[PDB]
């Protein structure tokens, strides 16, 4: 994978380009069904070991049923949406009268059916575990025929295996208030996730991307609990729909660019605030300042547009022209000179100021480079570890080419007597207006 | 343990002294190994209870193998480092050709061995 990185000395920043995007623009709601059987009484009275075990399993099942019945830097601009809005909407629609009957009647002969609800929504419903099946015709006949005295322990073991999923699901629903994320393996296995992705009415490229990264897709999805009545437990899985695939995406890292004036209290420091990922979608590229919202997996950047911002394409130029008149880059300013480093994808940016000792070393030769004063950049091929002061970082060993694009750091363009050091989200033009 | 505290009214603050420090300055990377066996087919066809159970366990093992194959106030001054930089570096070195062979050959007779990889 021909991944590339650029380091600019003008802002002591680094852009990593050459990724494949996966931008969650929609939500796909699928009604997962577990057909249960509401056992009204477990009237066994035998004190035998097998009877003790089978009554224990029936008691956990009944308590599970009763529990499921009881259940019924730029981040401040992100709009607080309801990640479980679609699932809770479908659940409320299912809470109407006559919806459970349609869900049950549509799945009498098949495993997957599109049901038209009263809201007007057509939902894909799929039975992933028919506990009702195993209980009514495979379990209750044996237990009732032998009068609660199981003859062989294998049936108890297979009852454990089948009821373990229901018990685990009940556990997460109890300790998580009916909303769990990411979707555990108990709610949706990997085979079932692949199958559900394949059966979506979307293009083939989105299918292949999600089929290659089912794990990240599961990490980005939600599970919402819905009705349990009339021998059926339905819950809505809310899967990410990446309406845009294979777009250019680049990550921006920034380090504190501070001056190295001789006087302690008279230096000034600058830092670009728009760090994070930029994934290109249509007219204006998506931006994610919260790195937790993006996941990098084998050069594939999976991110969520709900926790993102929509900006023009000119944000890419924020890396090329810092004084451009068509985009105003955002920065923060301060005067606290602390030396620190950021580990990029293809190297490490080290800002070494004051008397802090900074070195770059590989394990088989010791210290190979001594970082002088300023913001510098070290590659990833020749060095394994970096050390600033007495704190130790390790350089990412990703395979790829890094370009040390030379430049004059912009900090020398400001007068320390005029530098405003009280900004958390600033802009180049408004900082210039502050200077003015 | 002779732990002590001081409260100052001048800043309405409190300092607790008398602790023993443990300051993470380095990372130690150890290669933990689980030797698996890639079963190519589970061709059992019996519908017996024990056969049902054993095929279930073999199927979970095979699906586990397939899944593991598929996987392949002053805080703003803190430098964003890669906490998994050392581990991912060793993993990329292991992804080269001939590294798995060395890891396997070194642990043929013992449980713990120091292996010299191509990175050095």
């Amino acid at each position, epitope marked *: 994978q021909n991944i590339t990185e650029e380091f600019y000395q003008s802002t002591c920043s680094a852009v990593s380009k050459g990724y494949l995007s996966a931008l969650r623009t929609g939500w796909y709601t699928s009604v997962i069904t577990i057909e249960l059987s509401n056992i009204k009484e477990i009237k066994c009275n035998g004190t035998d070991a097998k009877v003790k075990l089978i009554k224990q399993e029936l008691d956990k099942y009944k308590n599970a049923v009763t529990e499921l019945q009881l259940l019924m830097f730029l981040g401040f601009l992100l709009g607080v949406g309801s990640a479980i809005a679609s699932g809770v909407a479908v659940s409320k629609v299912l809470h109407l009268e006559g919806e459970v009957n349609k869900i049950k009647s549509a799945l*009498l*002969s*098949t*495993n*997957k*059916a*599109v049901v*038209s609800l009263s809201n007007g929504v*057509s939902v*894909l419903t*799929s*039975k*992933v*575990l*028919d506990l009702k*099946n*195993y209980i009514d*015709k495979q379990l209750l006949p044996i237990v009732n025929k032998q009068s609660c005295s199981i003859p062989n322990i294998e049936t108890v073991i297979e009852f454990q295996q089948k009821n373990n999923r229901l018990l685990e699901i009940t556990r997460e629903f109890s300790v998580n208030a009916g909303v769990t994320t990411p979707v555990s393996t108990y709610m949706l296995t990997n*085979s*079932e996730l692949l*199958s559900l992705i*394949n*059966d*979506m*009415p*979307i293009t083939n490229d989105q299918k292949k991307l999600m089929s290659n990264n089912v794990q990240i897709v599961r990490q980005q999805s939600y599970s919402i609990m819905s009705i349990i009545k009339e021998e059926v437990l339905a819950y809505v899985v809310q899967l990410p729909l990446y309406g845009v695939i294979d777009t250019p995406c680049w990550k921006l890292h920034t380090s504190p660019l501070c001056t190295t004036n001789t006087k302690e209290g008279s230096n000034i420091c600058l830092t670009r605030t728009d760090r994070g990922w930029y994934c290109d979608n249509a007219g204006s590229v998506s931006f994610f300042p919260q790195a937790e919202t993006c996941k990098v997996q084998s050069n594939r950047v999976f991110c969520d547009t709900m926790n993102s911002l929509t900006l023009p394409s000119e944000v890419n130029l924020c890396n090329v022209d810092i004084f451009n008149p068509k985009y105003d880059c955002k920065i923060m300013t301060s005067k606290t000179d602390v030396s620190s480093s950021v580990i990029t994808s293809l190297g490490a940016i080290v800002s070494c100021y004051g008397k802090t000792k900074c070195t770059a070393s590989n394990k088989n030769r010791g210290i190979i480079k001594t970082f002088s004063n300023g913001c510098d950049y070290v590659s990833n091929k020749g060095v394994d570890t970096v050390s600033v002061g007495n704190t130790l970082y390790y350089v990412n060993k990703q395979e790829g080419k890094s370009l040390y694009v030379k430049g004059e750091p912009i900090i020398n363009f400001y007068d320390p007597l005029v530098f405003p050091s009280d900004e958390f989200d600033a802009s180049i033009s408004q900082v210039n207006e502050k200077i003015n | 343990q002779n732990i002590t505290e001081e409260f100052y009214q001048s800043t309405c603050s409190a300092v607790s002294k008398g602790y023993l420090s443990a300051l993470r300055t380095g990372w130690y990377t150890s290669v933990i190994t689980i030797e698996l066996s890639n079963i190519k087919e589970i061709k059992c*066809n019996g*519908t017996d209870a024990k056969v049902k159970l054993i095929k279930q366990e073999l199927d979970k093992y095979k699906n586990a193998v397939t899944e593991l194959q598929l996987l392949m106030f002053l805080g703003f001054l803190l430098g964003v480092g890669s906490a998994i930089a050392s581990g991912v570096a060793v993993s990329k070195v292991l992804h080269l050709e001939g590294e798995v062979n060395k890891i396997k050959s070194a642990l043929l007779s013992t449980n713990k061995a120091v292996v010299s990889l191509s990175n050095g």
Partner: antibody, heavy 121, light 112 residues
Framework: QVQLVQSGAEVKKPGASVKLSCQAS????????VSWLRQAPGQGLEWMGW????????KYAPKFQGRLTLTTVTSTGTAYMELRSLKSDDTALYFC??????????????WGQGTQVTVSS | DVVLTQSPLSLPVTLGQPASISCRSS???????????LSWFHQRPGHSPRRLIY???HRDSGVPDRFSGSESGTDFTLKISRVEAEDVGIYYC?????????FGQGTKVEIK
């Protein structure tokens, strides 16, 4: 009350193509798909292919790959099936039936009366 | 592909008596959830076939009391409570879990 109506009979020489129609009524076609089946005089039924009107996913039998292509028209709720390489094994009655929108067990609830296509020289 | 064998292939029956049609699979038809899918279809001469049983021991809409069939493990059954003069035709069994969806050969049923 579900209805599937098929076109009239047809006669063709070997080497031509066959395009058959199956018009649905009485239900939301878009929530289901259609499987096409064949019934030649003297033999049973053969599943030729299934195509969903919901997602467009389609699957053909191995014996029929290289000759079959199915096309759904949702504007009027009709199925169309194209087969090529006509030989004596094409004189048969062709049957329409409904099926789930996704890869799952087949329902095959309602069937159309069939369209008869005969080949000869 | 799983091949389904029907038994028998010719069914001469007397009016009012029961009838039996068995379908036997070559491999397990149990899906991921646990549902075993075998369906039965009745075709009268000159007309299209009509679904009769959709899941094992599940009667279909409009199917009269005379029809039922239930079996587990490897075999599946079609039991006619009382054959009438309207039950002439041919019956097919069908699996839906494995691709391609294979039918049976079909047994003809006439009144003696």
């Amino acid at each position: 009350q579900v209805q599937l109506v098929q076109s009239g009979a047809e006669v063709k020489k070997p080497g031509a193509s066959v395009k058959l129609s199956c018009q649905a009524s009485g239900y939301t076609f878009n929530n289901y798909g259609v499987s096409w089946l064949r019934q030649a005089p003297g033999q049973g039924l053969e599943w030729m292919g299934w195509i969903s009107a919901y997602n467009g996913n389609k699957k053909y039998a191995p014996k029929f790959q290289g000759r079959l292509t199915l096309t759904t028209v949702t504007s009027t709720g009709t199925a169309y099936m194209e087969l090529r390489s006509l030989k004596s094994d094409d004189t048969a009655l062709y049957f329409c039936a409904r099926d789930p929108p996704a890869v799952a067990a087949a329902m095959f609830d309602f069937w159309g009366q069939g369209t008869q296509v005969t080949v000869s020289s | 592909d799983v091949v389904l064998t029907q038994s028998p292939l010719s069914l001469p029956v007397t009016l009012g008596q029961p009838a039996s049609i068995s379908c036997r699979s070559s491999q397990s038809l149990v899906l991921s959830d646990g549902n075993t899918y075998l369906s039965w279809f009745h075709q009268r001469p000159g007309h299209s076939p009509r679904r009769l049983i959709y899941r094992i021991s599940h009667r279909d809409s409009g199917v009269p009391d005379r029809f039922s069939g239930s079996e587990s493990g490897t075999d599946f059954t079609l039991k006619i409570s009382r054959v009438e003069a309207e039950d002439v035709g041919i019956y097919y069994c069908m699996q839906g879990t494995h691709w391609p969806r294979t039918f049976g050969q079909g047994t003809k049923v006439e009144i003696k």
